[PDB]
Amino acid sequence: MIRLIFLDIDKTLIPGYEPDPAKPIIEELKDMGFEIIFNSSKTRAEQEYYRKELEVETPFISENGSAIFIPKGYFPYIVIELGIRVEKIREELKKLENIYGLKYYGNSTKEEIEKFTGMPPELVPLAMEREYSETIFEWSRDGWEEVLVEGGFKVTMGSRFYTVHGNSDKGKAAKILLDFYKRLGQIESYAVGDSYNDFPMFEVVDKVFIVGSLKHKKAQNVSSIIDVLEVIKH
């Protein structure tokens, strides 16, 4: 049987932006025989950095399930796009930008982005390589969300800011990836997250953990990712 776990990153796997704290977690999960799938709002460029740093070479899912990346020849990258291109999102944000005082990646400076996100300077370039979504760092007037929703977009609160994306989510992407594993055998699925963008995942796995206080029906709350591992041991 295949044990697979979907791991969110920000505010779930690591405290901040440095990968180091997660090394022990990934090693332990690997020793326990898990297939570790990152499923984060982070861009593919950002996740490739974490993957390389943590030696994770499994499929991963980016920008709130907007795309599934499967390493060439992984199953006995191949990209499955499920969201919408970021240029279409920016076209609409541009129209709303000066109506709602919006600040997002496309209209903010590296400096602003660092201040908004608390991101280490050297990592900001990976965050700016967006393919299917935007992040709203701030606004000066409410109402833009309703407008984007009616325009066909999804607005989902993440670990730090709202994310504007297309017609997909972490669960739709997880569900599709889970089918690939099912062709290989029986699966015991887990999901670990921390915010609203993680809810769609919870609806598709057997066991669910939430790091922090956000409550969810099918989810068991814990204070940290370490706890998740302890619980799993049993």
Ligand SMILES: [Mg+2]
């Ligand atoms: Mg998160």
